[PDB]
């Protein structure tokens, strides 16, 4: 028995903060039915940097 939760949409903010090593990154997501901001861990931020995600991508 498993569950699936998915966040997708417009990237409107990519603000990472430290304390060389980042502490967390706050990402705001936007869709056609509203916006929703999230807090994210730097392990996920490494994959975000790998995917070459800038402001304005889906």
């Amino acid at each position: 028995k498993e569950t699936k939760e998915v966040y997708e949409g417009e990237v409107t903010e990519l603000t990472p903060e430290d304390a060389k090593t980042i502490s967390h990154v706050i990402v705001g997501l936007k869709s056609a039915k509203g916006t929703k901001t999230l807090r994210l861990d730097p392990t996920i931020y490494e994959s975000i940097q790998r995917e070459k995600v800038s402001i304005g991508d889906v």
Binding site: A32, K33, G34, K36
Partner: peptide, 9 residues
Amino acid sequence: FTGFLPTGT
């Protein structure tokens, strides 16, 4: 206004 605002407003 439903577009650019956070959800539930």
